[PDB]
């Protein structure tokens, strides 16, 4: 099933990267009641908050991520979105390795490194979600950008497992 395995790996790599990049770009992570400058229903993201109704509707303001070393570090890490962006970068490099595998079948470690990038991307994604939720805590609902990040995590982990299966079976088949 190596053809189907490589198909799943490539399609999944593209899907994880697309979902995570959209999530990091779009602004529907959190539905709350704040203010775009009275409080109205808004829809914030990782960088901007916007009004969902009323006169100023469609008006967005940069999130003042900033207004205790731990509080300072959490606010810094959440302000720069280090972890979501790191997970996007690692998904990009994993995609590059998956593509490069076919154009260079001499080296085996290429697809193994793809798998490791995808697994690492998932872990960065988890840390981002935790930092984001924790920083918000310092009524509401989660939007579709949040769930795009979550689905990116699940797909990234699946593609990593498939990639490692491909590498294992190549070494098992060739060695014996």
């Amino acid at each position: 099933d190596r053809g189907i395995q490589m198909l799943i790996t490539t399609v999944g790599a593209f899907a994880a990267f697309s979902l995570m990049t959209i999530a990091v770009g779009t602004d529907y992570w959190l539905y709350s009641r704040g203010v775009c400058r009275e409080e109205v229903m808004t829809h914030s993201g990782l960088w901007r908050t916007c009004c969902l109704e009323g006169a100023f509707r469609g008006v967005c303001k940069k999130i003042d991520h900033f207004p205790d070393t731990a509080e300072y570090l959490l606010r810094a890490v959440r302000a720069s979105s280090v972890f979501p962006i790191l997970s996007v970068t690692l998904l990009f490099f994993g995609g590059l390795c998956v593509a490069a595998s076919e154009f260079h079948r001499s080296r085996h470690s290429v697809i193994l490194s793809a798998g490791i990038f995808f697994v690492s991307a998932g872990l960065s994604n988890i840390i981002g979600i935790i930092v984001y939720i924790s920083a918000n805590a310092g009524s509401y609902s989660y939007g579709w950008s949040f769930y795009f990040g979550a689905f990116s995590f699940i797909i990234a982990e699946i593609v990593g497992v498939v990639a490692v299966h491909i590498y294992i079976e190549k070494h098992q088949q060739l060695r014996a």
Partner: protein, 105 residues
């Protein structure tokens, strides 16, 4: 805000300022808003038996009216005249309205 641009009774603003203006209009008199020097509302010191603050200013003759948020009390009604109340109120309690911590577990 920017009282320096103004001088006299026109240096101040607030509910009682407009109320004094409206009372002056209806009664037909001119007036100068003098802030009490003590900065105290009014009380009879049990030792000296002297009234201080706005009530003292009224009784001793230094002032002719008091248009501050001055509560109607029995002790004050015995020494100064009060009109019908222009605002209701009561004594009330004012109180101040904790991040768990990363390793709080």
């Amino acid at each position: 805000k920017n009282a320096n641009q103004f001088e006299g009774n026109d240096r101040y603003e607030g509910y009682c300022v407009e109320l004094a203006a409206e009372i002056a209009k209806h009664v037909g008199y001119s007036y100068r808003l003098e802030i009490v020097s003590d900065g105290k509302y009014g009380a009879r010191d049990p030792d000296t038996k002297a009234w201080n603050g706005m009530v003292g200013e009224l009784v001793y003759g230094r002032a002719d009216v008091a248009v501050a948020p001055l509560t109607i009390t029995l002790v004050r009604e015995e020494v100064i005249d009060f009109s019908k109340p222009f605002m209701s109120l009561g004594i009330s309690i004012m109180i101040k309205k904790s991040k768990p911590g990363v390793f709080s577990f």
